[PDB]
């Protein structure tokens, strides 16, 4: 085996410094192809890791470079023939690779060959091969290098458009399948989902099925750190494409059960975008919405954490946009939201310190809040006053304003009475 392998490597080497032409070699290509279909089959075996990896490497690389050469120059018949066989082989490899490591990277060289090779590569052979490529990328580094190179590089025809997104729809199906099990494997799966995103951040194309899938999916049994990493991954995968903020917003608004995903995409926009004060507005909208609905009532288990998540999305937003107007209308709103524990944490975080202290200084905003509270609604008003107080500086004007508040406060027959109680505490 070793002796035979050594001879094969030698042969490969020889053909390496003798392949500076490549004209009418369709014959060579075909022969090679059939031989190597069989050879790949045989190849899945043993052979001192990389003794086999080297062999395989040569074969693939060599093979693809030649098969796709056919595609470039020559005849479609031959091309199709090779593809059919090669696709089968690709499928086979997508299985072997792991232990090989060096030859797993040789299989990665074969996938890079598919990239160069284009439509043939893209087809039957590369349906399973795109899946494998995704896996490899999410397994990492060198793959990533090549991948981001192609992330700018006309995107490999945006990974072959329809098919690219169809593979992504297969990935949507896979996301659904992961929602089921997937610990670190699914972490990398999501990584590769986003790898494809980087490759062809063709959002719309990807679309619908996947959208729904993802939505449902945000509740994996094995969250841990991989889970949040991947949360970030999908959110940041949204990045900045077509429908972007809008699309995201839509699905999220529907099932207001996932504002961590809101944060994710908020932040996706924050580190990947366009229409920027317009994105401040989008953000603003979502943010505002969130607070307004949620903090419009109360909660206990899940939605207390939902409020926490809301603080996080506020975060992304606020920081990213320096939005200040939109942002702090919602901060005076959202800040006013703070309430207990976690609240404060989230508040400062979202605040993005400059503006946090800006608000601290701010008294016009305070007056706005004063009258807001005057109109009242519930506990929102109550705690608004609470944190207003917390935000100590110097009443002065606010002292006079609050005297008026009290007066109203005092008056209160209904729950406006307890509002006044808390207010009074603040005043004290």
Q: Is 118 in the site for other proteins (CB under 8 A)?
A: no
User: Which class for 399: exposed (0-12), middle (13-18), buried (19 or more C-beta within 10 A)?
Assistant: exposed
**What three-state secondary structure class fits 353?**
coil
Stretch that binds other proteins, among 51-59, 68-76, 157-165, 265-273 (CB under 8 A): 157-165
CB-nearer residue toward other proteins: 224 or 246: 246
Q: Name the residue nearer to other proteins (CB basis): 47 or 203.
A: 203
Number of residues that bind other proteins (CB under 8 A): 17
Nearer to other proteins (CB atom), residue 162 or residue 221:
162
Work out how close the CB of 255 gets to other proteins at its nearest, in angstroms, rounded to a whole number.
Answer: 16
The answer to whether 31 touches 83, Cβ cutoff 8 Å, is no
Q: Which is nearer to other proteins, 119 or 416 (CB)?
A: 119
Residue with tokens 């207001």: 256
Footprint on residues 204-263 left by other proteins (CB under 8 A)? 204, 242-243, 245-246, 249-250
What is the spatial distance between Cα 295 and Cα 300, in angstroms, rounded to a whole number? 12
Kindly give, in sequence order, each residue whose CB lies less than 8 Å from that of residue 83, ignoring residues fewer than 6 positions away. 67, 120, 121, 123, 124, 125
Residue list 54-73, contact with other proteins (CB under 8 A): none
CA 273/CA 234 separation, integer angstroms: 15
**Binding track over 162-201 against other proteins, x by CB under 8 A:** xxxxxx-x--------------------------------
Which of 148, 285, 363, 406 binds other proteins (CB under 8 A)? It is: 285
Q: Residue 389 to residues 73, 76, 120, 213, 365: CA-CA distances in angstroms?
A: 77, 77, 68, 45, 13
After which residues is the backbone of the chain broken at C–N > 2.5 Å? none
User: Between residues 248 and 347, which has the closer beta carbon with respect to other proteins?
Assistant: 248
Of residues 162 and 377, the one with the C-beta less far from other proteins: 162
Give contact residues for other proteins (rule: CB under 8 A).
161-167, 169, 204, 242-243, 245-246, 249-250, 282, 285
């Amino acid at each position: 085996x070793x002796x035979x392998x050594x001879x094969x490597x030698x042969x490969x080497x020889x053909x390496x410094x003798x392949x500076x032409x490549x004209x009418x070699x369709x014959x060579x290509x075909x022969x090679x192809x059939x031989x190597x279909x069989x050879x790949x089959x045989x190849x899945x075996x043993x052979x001192x890791x990389x003794x086999x990896x080297x062999x395989x490497x040569x074969x693939x690389x060599x093979x693809x470079x030649x098969x796709x050469x056919x595609x470039x120059x020559x005849x479609x018949x031959x091309x199709x023939x090779x593809x059919x066989x090669x696709x089968x082989x690709x499928x086979x490899x997508x299985x072997x690779x792991x232990x090989x490591x060096x030859x797993x990277x040789x299989x990665x060289x074969x996938x890079x060959x598919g990239x160069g090779x284009x439509x043939x590569x893209x087809x039957x052979x590369x349906x399973x091969x795109x899946x494998x490529x995704x896996x490899x990328x999410x397994x990492x580094x060198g793959x990533x290098x090549x991948x981001x190179x192609x992330x700018x590089x006309x995107x490999x025809x945006x990974x072959x458009x329809x098919x690219x997104x169809x593979x992504x729809x297969x990935x949507x199906x896979x996301x659904x399948x992961x929602x089921x099990x997937x610990x670190x494997x699914x972490x990398x799966x999501x990584x590769x989902x986003x790898x494809x995103x980087x490759x062809x951040x063709x959002x719309x194309x990807x679309x619908x099925x996947x959208x729904x899938x993802x939505x449902x999916x945000x509740x994996x049994x094995x969250x841990x750190x991989x889970x949040x990493x991947x949360x970030x991954x999908x959110x940041x995968x949204x990045x900045x494409x077509x429908x972007x903020x809008x699309x995201x917003x839509x699905x999220x608004x529907x099932x207001x059960x996932x504002x961590x995903x809101x944060x994710x995409x908020x932040x996706x926009x924050x580190x990947x975008x366009x229409x920027x004060x317009x994105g401040x507005x989008x953000x603003x909208x979502x943010x505002x919405x969130x607070x307004x609905x949620x903090x419009x009532x109360x909660x206990x288990x899940x939605x207390x954490x939902x409020x926490x998540x809301x603080x996080x999305x506020x975060x992304x937003x606020x920081x990213x946009x320096x939005x200040x107007x939109x942002x702090x209308x919602x901060x005076x709103x959202x800040x006013x939201x703070x309430x207990x524990x976690x609240x404060x944490g989230x508040x400062x975080x979202x605040x993005x310190x400059x503006x946090x202290x800006x608000x601290x200084x701010x008294x016009x905003x305070x007056x706005x809040x004063x009258x807001x509270x005057x109109x009242x609604x519930x506990x929102x008003x109550x705690x608004x006053x609470x944190x207003x107080x917390x935000x100590x500086x110097x009443x002065x004007x606010x002292x006079x304003x609050x005297x008026x508040x009290x007066x109203x406060x005092x008056x209160x027959x209904x729950x406006x009475x307890x509002x006044x109680x808390x207010x009074x505490x603040x005043x004290x």
